[PDB]
Amino acid sequence: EIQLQQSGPELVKPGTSVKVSCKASGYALTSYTMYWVKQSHGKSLEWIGYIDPYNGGTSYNQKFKGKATLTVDKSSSTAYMHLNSLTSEDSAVYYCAGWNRYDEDWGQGTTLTVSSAKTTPPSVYPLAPQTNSMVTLGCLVKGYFPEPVTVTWNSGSLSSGVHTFPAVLQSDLYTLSSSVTVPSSTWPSETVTCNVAHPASSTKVDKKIVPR
Amino acid sequence: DIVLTQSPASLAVSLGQRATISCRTSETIDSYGNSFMHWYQQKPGQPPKLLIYPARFSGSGSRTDFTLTINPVEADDVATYYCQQTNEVMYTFGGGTKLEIKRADAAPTVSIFPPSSEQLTSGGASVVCFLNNFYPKDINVKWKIDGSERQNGVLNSWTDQDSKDSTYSMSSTLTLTKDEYERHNSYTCEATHSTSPIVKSFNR
Numbered sequence A: 001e002i003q004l005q006q007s008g009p010e011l012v013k014p015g016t017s018v019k020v021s022c023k024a025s026g027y028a029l030t031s032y033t034m035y036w037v038k039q040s041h042g043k044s045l046e047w048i049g050y051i052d053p054y055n056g057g058t059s060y061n062q063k064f065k066g067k068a069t070l071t072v073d074k075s076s077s078t079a080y081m082h083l084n085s086l087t088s089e090d091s092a093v094y095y096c097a098g099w100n101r102y103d104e105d106w107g108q109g110t111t112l113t114v115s116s117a118k119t120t121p122p123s124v125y126p127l128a129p130q131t132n133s134m135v136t137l138g139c140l141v142k143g144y145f146p147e148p149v150t151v152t153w154n155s156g157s158l159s160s161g162v163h164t165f166p167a168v169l170q171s172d173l174y175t176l177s178s179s180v181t182v183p184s185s186t187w188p189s190e191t192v193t194c195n196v197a198h199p200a201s202s203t204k205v206d207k208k209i210v211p212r
Numbered sequence B: 001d002i003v004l005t006q007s008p009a010s011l012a013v014s015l016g017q018r019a020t021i022s023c024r025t026s027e028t029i030d031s032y033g034n035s036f037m038h039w040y041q042q043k044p045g046q047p048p049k050l051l052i053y054p055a056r057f058s059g060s061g062s063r064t065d066f067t068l069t070i071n072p073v074e075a076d077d078v079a080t081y082y083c084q085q086t087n088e089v090m091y092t093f094g095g096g097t098k099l100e101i102k103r104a105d106a107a108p109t110v111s112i113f114p115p116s117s118e119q120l121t122s123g124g125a126s127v128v129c130f131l132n133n134f135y136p137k138d139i140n141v142k143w144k145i146d147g148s149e150r151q152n153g154v155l156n157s158w159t160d161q162d163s164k165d166s167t168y169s170m171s172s173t174l175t176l177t178k179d180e181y182e183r184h185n186s187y188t189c190e191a192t193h194s195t196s197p198i199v200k201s202f203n204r
C-alpha cells in the first residue's frame, strides 16, 4: 500500500500564494494517481483536480482552474498543490489522496487559514474540582489564533474519558476546553497533565492538574 | 458534467437497524464503465475512509441509482457518508448524508470549576461548566451569579455525537473581568431536560 504525510497548518495573508505538500512512501509511487480535495468547515468534499505522475497529465475542477496547480516531485515522492490569490474562501482543510486499482490512501489533511489577523499562542489554565466514584478534570485554552490546537491528556495515555470541545471564535481569538472524567482512586494518586500544542505559534504546553 | 444527488441529507437511525443511503448520478455507469462509484465514511476531524472493500457495509445498484446499506447499524457508525464517482474527466462527491443515532434519553453529568489562580493573576475570570454524556442534543443552559441570571460573556460549544455511547456533551464558559468576578460569591450552573433541573454550584 501507500502512506501519505501532508505538510502542517498554515496561516497566510489574503492575496498571497501557498504550496502544500503530500509526501508518499511505499511501493510503486509512480503508479498512483494523486488528487486533492477541499473541505470547508462543516461543508462537503470538493474535488480540486488530479495528476497522474506516470504521464504527467492533470485534470482540474473548473472552479479551481485559475487557482490550483498540481505537481509531483518524482525524485522525492512528494505531490504539491500550489494555491494562488488567496482569499478567506480558501480557508479550509485540504486533503491529498492517491489511488490505483489495488489501493487508495488519504493524507491527514492540512488546515489553511487566510487571514489578516496575527498569530497568537493559547493561554492554558488548569481546571481542578464531593468524593464520587469518578472525578472530572478540565483544561481551558483561551485566546489563540489560528486553529488548529491539539489537546491530549498524559501525553495520550488517557483517551477513554476525554471530551474536547470545538473551539469558538470571539473577536479575533479562539477558545476551547477539554475535560477528562477519571476514577477518584486514580486522581490525585496519579498525576494527570494536560498537553496543549499550537502548531502555528510553535508552542507546546504541559499543565499538571493540581487540587486547590 | 457529472452531478451526484445524495438522499437523505441526514438520517436518524436506531442501533441494530438497517440503514440505506442513496446516490443518483446524471452520468450512467455501465458494468464496463468509464466511471466508478464508491462510498466513503467521514468522522469529524478525520479523512474520509473508503468503504465496502459478511460485511456490515454493502453496496447495490448500477446505472444511475446506487445504495449503501448498513446492517446492523452500530454506535461508531456516526459519521457523514459520501458517494464518489470517478471518471477520467472529473471526480465528484455527493453532498453527504449525516447519520444520527437514536438512543434513550440521558441526563447530563454536570461539573463546574472556578477561575484558576493562573487566570486570576492574568486579570481575567472564566467559570467553566461541563454537561457531559447527555441525549438528546438540544439542551438549554442558564446560570445565575448569587441568584442573578447572566446572559453576558457565556461560551457554548457542543461535541459531535459520541462514537461509543451515542451521547452529546457540551461546554459552557462564563467570562468576566477579574474585578467583576470578585464582587460576588455564588455561581450556579443549571441544565434542563419530572423536569429535574440539574444544578451545580460553587461559593466564593
Ligand SMILES: COc1c(N2CCN[C@@H](C)C2)c(F)cc2c(=O)c(C(=O)O)cn(C3CC3)c12
Binding pocket: A099, A100, A101, A102, A103, A104, B036, B038, B050, B053, B084, B086
Ligand atoms: C482503489 O479503489 C478502487 C477505485 N477507487 C476507490 C474510490 N476512489 C477512486 C478515486 C479510486 C477505483 F476507481 C476502481 C477500483 C477498481 O477498479 C477495482 C477492481 O477490482 O477492478 C477495485 N478497487 C478497489 C476495491 C476498491 C478500485
Ligand code: NA
Binding pocket: A017, A084, A085
Ligand atoms: Na503566484
Ligand code: NA
Binding pocket: A001, A102, A103
Ligand atoms: Na495490493
Ligand code: NA
Binding pocket: A162, A163, A164, B159, B160, B162
Ligand atoms: Na467526543
